[PDB]
């Protein structure tokens, strides 16, 4: 009855406590080690709960809600977790005071719809506001994500690369399609942008002075054959006593590799790619017939090529034909930092691309790897929904005044419950104050009073310890995704408060 | 499962790292106390290497495991000052423990250390000094690295190894490019010889000899045939396992030999090949026929070693005798043999007779552990020459620049009105612990020795002076010519701060 | 190191013992500081914010911590203000010395480095301070009343403040005499009236009465202090009075008057017309028979005077004590132009004896009032304001309040350590970091963040001056020179002198052993 609910209030808070310091771009990291002893360190809240594997029953309720927030959005699942826990925290003293739990479900269901009516009424459409080209607006919203970082001096260069990566793709946008490579050496402004698929190309075997790097419409072959001479896959050794038999044995070792190689020429492959390495003996046969050979391709890069060229990856060589051979328009090789890089540009299905960073350290590319995933989604959700609201916990402060002022006119038990729903929304900006090292006392006390004075978009400035209009600063977040999160948190809490007794089959 | 939050979680991680700090606080510098390490096989090694300590330190605490990954990239990035990053990484948390009691969040300390690290890097570029500016020579380049090899067992021939290190780096990389590739230098070893018998080959070298002692000791022809079997009655590659059926088949194999010893040897001249590097050795009848035609060869060459010959020579492997041709022949300037007096080595020394992009430093020595100390001292010496060509500007090592970085940071603290100023003051006092430990390892007062230099850089003169760690004449190590690289002095304060920010951003560790 | 003999472990017990006393009173710093509870074993509970009463009610036992109690008692006579700040400075220095002892530094080397820091510290405060005109009573009036406005009695601070300036000015010359003694300032109080009536009497005012003397007024009186009691014969050894009949009983009643009148007549020869009797409850200080004979010789009866007031009267008219009548002479007399009792409605039974006309510089401020706390709390404001006026006589310089000079001390001493050699650098840098607790403590007490207030004020001093400080009135960083909240320099000088030397004293202790 009553005590089983209090056990579920605290059983969910420890889950929120596991990802409490991850809210915001500048959140804290954790260290979760699996059974094999592998180290996994990430600030993403969804990845923490995936590996914890909490066996508690009331804890798995929020895990199922977070997975739905990740499947649809892929970001912001922590905000669903901390808010779902705070709805249980503020109602904790009211549960033990004799109030029924079902009455609370009517309050959250009442305040949740009241938030959607206020969010849609306050969100502002931004398509061509202020007479500005959208390339500048997408650059303005993107550069603010890169400020206060190691690349703050040359952020304008990197800010222009993201708008070029999205416009090169079709109307369907996807964050996984745009791959990011890391290459150590060089300055920050020397970072290149590839519209097609590319790989590191660690192939350093023979095949020099031939294998032209230009092609009109080459047939990209995707194989998994190790064409090395002394390969672990192809070999021939027959132990006998006859001497004349050994000449046929050494000839059979070269025929296994060579007979399989003739299938590559008869199939029509112009640019032959293979995951396993290719020996210097096989590269010469490609060089004699004027064929391009480049192996040591990762398996992940070929999956981006399979979506780009439109072919298929075959393990066997006998099945190589025109069915799996893709096509492209511009296939050329570059010299980024002196290292070789092959890439296919202008494919029919060019839905993916590649982006190579540069710098004199391995860690400067790590922080850049994280910031780019945040700038792409802003451009992805800005064109998807022109009606958006201010970021930095600004939308959470609007509902605190509206729902509270609305609760002051709703007599009955729904008052303190919808009123407590207002104070429960203060957990989002309070964590941005703590997860950034700022004083949450001065900010929330100065931020909440700004709205009564006339504030409507003021929020927590993650850069400086002060308040700022996040809408004017182009720190925007979607209005509908905020509604999908509040509806997810309200459904997450209402399922817990709806439970009053735990039943377990004895096993 | 583990669960710990709040300040007690931060302080538990500080002491978890301080345990490794005080462990490596004594093996710092030339007077660093050695460390006895017991391997899993029962062996016992003694050394003061910073990279070897963390490799064998099997500490189960997860905070200590982060410091092991710090040493991975630091070997190729710095190499020499491996012990200096941990004392600095540990000293920062020791003073930061005072900041956590003051009521500061760890991330603001992570921000303040990155703020002070820039005040340190910019100060290092001010006091640097070019050496090889627009001068292509090895006279000042060999002498600078000659002093760095004194803290190892190669002190008896530290002058010989310094010339080999400079001749090898200048080969695989050009001074005009300022891009020194260390992957083009391979390090081998062999039990026997001395430190002075270390050779430098611009090409490939293996511990293999020719198939007959009367072969030509000099092969000036660019004809190297890489085969998988020798020019004789062939045999398999893994195991022969000979078994005759009966006496009738026994006399027939002798007839097979007379045809094959005549068929394969004459085939070497038709393709213009002279040197036939093969996998297995030759028979006594094969070597007698090659002496008539002056055709060298090598016996019992390994599998993966033959692949390396084709990389330096650019040739191809000829797996069968049917496709013998001139295209699959190797390229080289001169292939010779080097016999070290009475020690019957007879090595295969392949060279290109020009400035190639592939060198091999074959270290010798009468003991395996002595050569083990020359490998790390040579590999650390490559990092000295790597940064010098990439940055001729260098600063004074031996604890000279660490005090200079503490003053510029303390001088810049009064002009930084923010909560990170306490971190700037703590980052200043933490930089002084690297030289303060050298004063303790030298057996002197760590406090009396530290402040006497700080007054010299202010009251006596503005340039920076070093601490007399090796019990030399006096301070001002510039006179002693003890100078480390500038990229290392910047990378030491970078990876050390970057590791502290990685720890301060962690507040809980959980494992099932 | 092996270190079998552990005298350094004895020093940590001396640090942690003294560290606990400072940490206890750490939160009661400043006007906005927290209050502390003091419960007696009998159950008497009282809560107050006075920094001096907290330590006296601790009953300290450890020897290292017992020195901090006398340290506060030293600041009372020298400075008389800021007693709470002295123990935090001393307590914080030991916390920093523990970091130095862990590095392997001897205590004596730390002690000598602090002397160079103390000497350099006084000059940092002396040059930056604001010299003032000591002869200008207006400057002493403004700085004295503004300090009381933040105290308990702030409505009467505008009236009691000039009483201290005119009283100090009456006994101390303007900018000529540097020695100032507060023992020449008597503050008498009685029931009835208000604080608004303040009578600055140049003579002496006693809380006694003239009864049963029927004179009550002596013109041209020669006041002579006699400690000997005039009563019947009282011999400690075994004695007995010879009484034969009822007539012999009458002989003793008459002869007892002969023993008294012979001593009374001995005094009148020297012209002594007023007497003073020390307070003594052990035996008869004065008999009923002596009250009448002194009326025949016209001498006023004055008794029940505590020893603390005799020193005030000794310097008022130049009197001396006489322990025996046979040694009484005209040399140990005084001088008085007029002597009588002035019993007003609110002034109470007060013996107004004016007209010293002798070597002495003494005054008396008569403060009336109805309630106890009205007259009691007003007396503290006089002593609290007298000390600041006394502090400015020795040190004619003013400095900002709210921990402003402490940050200027820590900012410049950090750069001073950069120009030193030996083990003086870390000791001076540790001496400066220990001073950052006073502003961080006031920052916490004012509701602000402890570190953000002191961190930004250091840069405000590096770029500007020490004018910026912590304002407890408005609760934030503000130009305190605009707030007009000042404090004398001698409070900070003595707070740094007595505190650092006590730290050096404890650092000179390697072991303690109990004797018998």
PDB file of C-alpha atoms in Angstrom, chain C residues 237-417:
ATOM      1  CA  UNK C 237      45.260  35.948  70.359  1.00  0.00           C
ATOM      2  CA  UNK C 238      43.514  34.870  73.564  1.00  0.00           C
ATOM      3  CA  UNK C 239      42.239  37.900  75.485  1.00  0.00           C
ATOM      4  CA  UNK C 240      39.741  38.756  78.209  1.00  0.00           C
ATOM      5  CA  UNK C 241      38.181  41.983  79.478  1.00  0.00           C
ATOM      6  CA  UNK C 242      38.405  42.525  83.242  1.00  0.00           C
ATOM      7  CA  UNK C 243      34.850  43.190  84.480  1.00  0.00           C
ATOM      8  CA  UNK C 244      34.548  43.228  88.273  1.00  0.00           C
ATOM      9  CA  UNK C 245      31.144  44.911  88.758  1.00  0.00           C
ATOM     10  CA  UNK C 246      28.589  46.859  86.731  1.00  0.00           C
ATOM     11  CA  UNK C 247      30.812  49.931  87.159  1.00  0.00           C
ATOM     12  CA  UNK C 248      33.767  48.290  85.393  1.00  0.00           C
ATOM     13  CA  UNK C 249      31.397  47.518  82.510  1.00  0.00           C
ATOM     14  CA  UNK C 250      30.892  51.280  82.120  1.00  0.00           C
ATOM     15  CA  UNK C 251      34.663  51.863  82.268  1.00  0.00           C
ATOM     16  CA  UNK C 252      35.132  49.779  79.112  1.00  0.00           C
ATOM     17  CA  UNK C 253      32.391  51.659  77.242  1.00  0.00           C
ATOM     18  CA  UNK C 254      34.146  54.954  78.014  1.00  0.00           C
ATOM     19  CA  UNK C 255      37.698  53.663  77.523  1.00  0.00           C
ATOM     20  CA  UNK C 256      36.658  52.137  74.188  1.00  0.00           C
ATOM     21  CA  UNK C 257      35.898  55.703  73.095  1.00  0.00           C
ATOM     22  CA  UNK C 258      39.362  56.725  74.317  1.00  0.00           C
ATOM     23  CA  UNK C 259      40.977  54.185  71.982  1.00  0.00           C
ATOM     24  CA  UNK C 260      38.939  55.629  69.101  1.00  0.00           C
ATOM     25  CA  UNK C 261      39.261  59.349  69.841  1.00  0.00           C
ATOM     26  CA  UNK C 262      43.034  59.106  70.347  1.00  0.00           C
ATOM     27  CA  UNK C 263      43.320  57.858  66.753  1.00  0.00           C
ATOM     28  CA  UNK C 264      40.755  60.355  65.448  1.00  0.00           C
ATOM     29  CA  UNK C 265      42.659  63.195  67.122  1.00  0.00           C
ATOM     30  CA  UNK C 266      45.874  61.815  65.607  1.00  0.00           C
ATOM     31  CA  UNK C 267      44.382  62.356  62.141  1.00  0.00           C
ATOM     32  CA  UNK C 268      43.015  65.882  62.669  1.00  0.00           C
ATOM     33  CA  UNK C 269      46.519  67.203  63.424  1.00  0.00           C
ATOM     34  CA  UNK C 270      47.440  66.812  59.737  1.00  0.00           C
ATOM     35  CA  UNK C 271      44.348  68.729  58.581  1.00  0.00           C
ATOM     36  CA  UNK C 272      42.771  65.607  57.066  1.00  0.00           C
ATOM     37  CA  UNK C 273      39.071  66.475  56.737  1.00  0.00           C
ATOM     38  CA  UNK C 274      37.852  63.514  54.621  1.00  0.00           C
ATOM     39  CA  UNK C 275      38.733  59.820  54.981  1.00  0.00           C
ATOM     40  CA  UNK C 276      38.559  56.785  52.695  1.00  0.00           C
ATOM     41  CA  UNK C 277      38.262  53.197  53.955  1.00  0.00           C
ATOM     42  CA  UNK C 278      39.137  50.213  51.778  1.00  0.00           C
ATOM     43  CA  UNK C 279      36.470  47.544  51.362  1.00  0.00           C
ATOM     44  CA  UNK C 280      36.975  44.738  53.886  1.00  0.00           C
ATOM     45  CA  UNK C 281      34.311  42.225  54.949  1.00  0.00           C
ATOM     46  CA  UNK C 282      36.632  40.065  57.081  1.00  0.00           C
ATOM     47  CA  UNK C 283      36.260  42.244  60.197  1.00  0.00           C
ATOM     48  CA  UNK C 284      34.765  45.515  61.445  1.00  0.00           C
ATOM     49  CA  UNK C 285      35.991  48.147  58.991  1.00  0.00           C
ATOM     50  CA  UNK C 286      34.335  50.969  60.962  1.00  0.00           C
ATOM     51  CA  UNK C 287      32.366  50.917  64.212  1.00  0.00           C
ATOM     52  CA  UNK C 288      29.225  52.863  65.084  1.00  0.00           C
ATOM     53  CA  UNK C 289      31.178  54.918  67.641  1.00  0.00           C
ATOM     54  CA  UNK C 290      33.583  56.253  64.992  1.00  0.00           C
ATOM     55  CA  UNK C 291      30.664  57.583  62.925  1.00  0.00           C
ATOM     56  CA  UNK C 292      29.949  60.172  65.647  1.00  0.00           C
ATOM     57  CA  UNK C 293      33.477  61.268  66.602  1.00  0.00           C
ATOM     58  CA  UNK C 294      34.208  62.012  62.939  1.00  0.00           C
ATOM     59  CA  UNK C 295      31.201  64.356  62.990  1.00  0.00           C
ATOM     60  CA  UNK C 296      32.755  66.247  65.910  1.00  0.00           C
ATOM     61  CA  UNK C 297      35.952  66.600  63.849  1.00  0.00           C
ATOM     62  CA  UNK C 298      33.840  67.114  60.678  1.00  0.00           C
ATOM     63  CA  UNK C 299      35.039  64.167  58.579  1.00  0.00           C
ATOM     64  CA  UNK C 300      32.884  62.363  56.023  1.00  0.00           C
ATOM     65  CA  UNK C 301      32.473  58.583  56.273  1.00  0.00           C
ATOM     66  CA  UNK C 302      33.331  56.765  53.023  1.00  0.00           C
ATOM     67  CA  UNK C 303      33.772  52.978  52.921  1.00  0.00           C
ATOM     68  CA  UNK C 304      33.090  49.840  50.838  1.00  0.00           C
ATOM     69  CA  UNK C 305      35.410  50.919  48.013  1.00  0.00           C
ATOM     70  CA  UNK C 306      36.818  48.078  45.925  1.00  0.00           C
ATOM     71  CA  UNK C 307      40.533  47.940  45.124  1.00  0.00           C
ATOM     72  CA  UNK C 308      39.820  48.560  41.425  1.00  0.00           C
ATOM     73  CA  UNK C 309      38.463  52.040  42.231  1.00  0.00           C
ATOM     74  CA  UNK C 310      41.321  53.057  44.556  1.00  0.00           C
ATOM     75  CA  UNK C 311      43.720  53.148  41.600  1.00  0.00           C
ATOM     76  CA  UNK C 312      41.305  55.529  39.867  1.00  0.00           C
ATOM     77  CA  UNK C 313      41.218  57.757  42.961  1.00  0.00           C
ATOM     78  CA  UNK C 314      44.999  57.525  43.442  1.00  0.00           C
ATOM     79  CA  UNK C 315      45.538  59.190  40.053  1.00  0.00           C
ATOM     80  CA  UNK C 316      42.639  61.638  40.583  1.00  0.00           C
ATOM     81  CA  UNK C 317      43.968  63.514  43.638  1.00  0.00           C
ATOM     82  CA  UNK C 318      47.318  61.839  44.356  1.00  0.00           C
ATOM     83  CA  UNK C 319      46.311  59.785  47.399  1.00  0.00           C
ATOM     84  CA  UNK C 320      48.271  56.907  48.930  1.00  0.00           C
ATOM     85  CA  UNK C 321      47.243  53.983  51.172  1.00  0.00           C
ATOM     86  CA  UNK C 322      47.986  54.017  54.905  1.00  0.00           C
ATOM     87  CA  UNK C 323      47.934  50.562  56.497  1.00  0.00           C
ATOM     88  CA  UNK C 324      48.438  51.718  60.106  1.00  0.00           C
ATOM     89  CA  UNK C 325      47.475  54.804  62.098  1.00  0.00           C
ATOM     90  CA  UNK C 326      50.921  55.281  63.659  1.00  0.00           C
ATOM     91  CA  UNK C 327      52.421  55.598  60.155  1.00  0.00           C
ATOM     92  CA  UNK C 328      49.778  58.148  59.116  1.00  0.00           C
ATOM     93  CA  UNK C 329      51.141  61.531  58.039  1.00  0.00           C
ATOM     94  CA  UNK C 330      50.239  64.610  56.012  1.00  0.00           C
ATOM     95  CA  UNK C 331      52.169  63.355  52.961  1.00  0.00           C
ATOM     96  CA  UNK C 332      49.607  60.680  51.978  1.00  0.00           C
ATOM     97  CA  UNK C 333      46.704  63.162  51.762  1.00  0.00           C
ATOM     98  CA  UNK C 334      44.798  64.484  48.765  1.00  0.00           C
ATOM     99  CA  UNK C 335      43.105  67.680  47.644  1.00  0.00           C
ATOM    100  CA  UNK C 336      39.454  68.626  47.193  1.00  0.00           C
ATOM    101  CA  UNK C 337      37.812  72.006  46.624  1.00  0.00           C
ATOM    102  CA  UNK C 338      34.295  70.737  47.394  1.00  0.00           C
ATOM    103  CA  UNK C 339      32.887  67.402  48.582  1.00  0.00           C
ATOM    104  CA  UNK C 340      29.248  66.407  49.059  1.00  0.00           C
ATOM    105  CA  UNK C 341      26.555  63.908  48.085  1.00  0.00           C
ATOM    106  CA  UNK C 342      24.355  64.788  45.099  1.00  0.00           C
ATOM    107  CA  UNK C 343      21.279  62.530  45.233  1.00  0.00           C
ATOM    108  CA  UNK C 344      19.082  63.223  42.196  1.00  0.00           C
ATOM    109  CA  UNK C 345      16.024  61.301  40.998  1.00  0.00           C
ATOM    110  CA  UNK C 346      17.910  59.226  38.417  1.00  0.00           C
ATOM    111  CA  UNK C 347      21.529  59.848  39.391  1.00  0.00           C
ATOM    112  CA  UNK C 348      21.035  58.093  42.729  1.00  0.00           C
ATOM    113  CA  UNK C 349      23.137  58.438  45.864  1.00  0.00           C
ATOM    114  CA  UNK C 350      26.400  59.641  44.315  1.00  0.00           C
ATOM    115  CA  UNK C 351      29.261  61.338  46.179  1.00  0.00           C
ATOM    116  CA  UNK C 352      30.142  64.289  43.940  1.00  0.00           C
ATOM    117  CA  UNK C 353      33.643  65.384  44.986  1.00  0.00           C
ATOM    118  CA  UNK C 354      35.122  67.793  42.426  1.00  0.00           C
ATOM    119  CA  UNK C 355      38.118  70.104  42.331  1.00  0.00           C
ATOM    120  CA  UNK C 356      41.188  67.869  42.199  1.00  0.00           C
ATOM    121  CA  UNK C 357      43.773  70.689  42.093  1.00  0.00           C
ATOM    122  CA  UNK C 358      46.524  68.057  42.175  1.00  0.00           C
ATOM    123  CA  UNK C 359      48.682  66.087  39.702  1.00  0.00           C
ATOM    124  CA  UNK C 360      46.332  63.783  37.817  1.00  0.00           C
ATOM    125  CA  UNK C 361      44.338  63.333  34.597  1.00  0.00           C
ATOM    126  CA  UNK C 362      41.009  61.695  35.463  1.00  0.00           C
ATOM    127  CA  UNK C 363      37.371  62.094  34.418  1.00  0.00           C
ATOM    128  CA  UNK C 364      34.015  60.432  35.065  1.00  0.00           C
ATOM    129  CA  UNK C 365      31.014  60.036  32.740  1.00  0.00           C
ATOM    130  CA  UNK C 366      27.804  59.583  34.746  1.00  0.00           C
ATOM    131  CA  UNK C 367      25.330  57.592  32.624  1.00  0.00           C
ATOM    132  CA  UNK C 368      21.805  57.343  34.037  1.00  0.00           C
ATOM    133  CA  UNK C 369      19.086  54.913  33.008  1.00  0.00           C
ATOM    134  CA  UNK C 370      16.036  52.931  34.110  1.00  0.00           C
ATOM    135  CA  UNK C 371      16.625  49.320  33.054  1.00  0.00           C
ATOM    136  CA  UNK C 372      19.719  47.222  33.721  1.00  0.00           C
ATOM    137  CA  UNK C 373      20.538  46.547  30.056  1.00  0.00           C
ATOM    138  CA  UNK C 374      19.979  50.240  29.278  1.00  0.00           C
ATOM    139  CA  UNK C 375      22.803  51.252  31.627  1.00  0.00           C
ATOM    140  CA  UNK C 376      24.800  48.038  31.107  1.00  0.00           C
ATOM    141  CA  UNK C 377      24.868  47.845  27.298  1.00  0.00           C
ATOM    142  CA  UNK C 378      25.570  51.589  27.150  1.00  0.00           C
ATOM    143  CA  UNK C 379      28.671  51.064  29.302  1.00  0.00           C
ATOM    144  CA  UNK C 380      30.016  48.500  26.825  1.00  0.00           C
ATOM    145  CA  UNK C 381      29.603  50.966  23.948  1.00  0.00           C
ATOM    146  CA  UNK C 382      31.735  53.470  25.876  1.00  0.00           C
ATOM    147  CA  UNK C 383      34.504  50.910  26.390  1.00  0.00           C
ATOM    148  CA  UNK C 384      34.132  49.673  22.804  1.00  0.00           C
ATOM    149  CA  UNK C 385      34.378  53.249  21.499  1.00  0.00           C
ATOM    150  CA  UNK C 386      37.090  54.279  23.973  1.00  0.00           C
ATOM    151  CA  UNK C 387      39.321  51.469  22.707  1.00  0.00           C
ATOM    152  CA  UNK C 388      39.040  52.578  19.074  1.00  0.00           C
ATOM    153  CA  UNK C 389      39.865  56.129  20.162  1.00  0.00           C
ATOM    154  CA  UNK C 390      42.726  54.662  22.198  1.00  0.00           C
ATOM    155  CA  UNK C 391      43.833  52.557  19.218  1.00  0.00           C
ATOM    156  CA  UNK C 392      44.052  55.654  17.001  1.00  0.00           C
ATOM    157  CA  UNK C 393      46.214  57.567  19.493  1.00  0.00           C
ATOM    158  CA  UNK C 394      48.987  54.983  19.168  1.00  0.00           C
ATOM    159  CA  UNK C 395      48.423  54.372  15.426  1.00  0.00           C
ATOM    160  CA  UNK C 396      47.203  57.532  13.670  1.00  0.00           C
ATOM    161  CA  UNK C 397      45.940  55.637  10.637  1.00  0.00           C
ATOM    162  CA  UNK C 398      42.648  54.151   9.437  1.00  0.00           C
ATOM    163  CA  UNK C 399      41.942  51.185   7.164  1.00  0.00           C
ATOM    164  CA  UNK C 400      38.891  49.660   5.519  1.00  0.00           C
ATOM    165  CA  UNK C 401      36.660  47.133   7.254  1.00  0.00           C
ATOM    166  CA  UNK C 402      35.120  43.832   6.279  1.00  0.00           C
ATOM    167  CA  UNK C 403      38.423  42.004   5.919  1.00  0.00           C
ATOM    168  CA  UNK C 404      39.672  44.466   3.293  1.00  0.00           C
ATOM    169  CA  UNK C 405      43.252  44.863   4.644  1.00  0.00           C
ATOM    170  CA  UNK C 406      43.641  41.091   5.039  1.00  0.00           C
ATOM    171  CA  UNK C 407      43.398  40.542   1.278  1.00  0.00           C
ATOM    172  CA  UNK C 408      45.920  43.317   0.597  1.00  0.00           C
ATOM    173  CA  UNK C 409      48.199  41.525   3.067  1.00  0.00           C
ATOM    174  CA  UNK C 410      47.889  38.185   1.260  1.00  0.00           C
ATOM    175  CA  UNK C 411      48.166  39.662  -2.243  1.00  0.00           C
ATOM    176  CA  UNK C 412      51.475  41.507  -1.825  1.00  0.00           C
ATOM    177  CA  UNK C 413      53.071  38.911   0.465  1.00  0.00           C
ATOM    178  CA  UNK C 414      52.636  36.332  -2.308  1.00  0.00           C
ATOM    179  CA  UNK C 415      54.873  38.454  -4.543  1.00  0.00           C
ATOM    180  CA  UNK C 416      57.228  39.160  -1.628  1.00  0.00           C
ATOM    181  CA  UNK C 417      57.925  35.422  -1.322  1.00  0.00           C
TER     182      UNK C 417
END
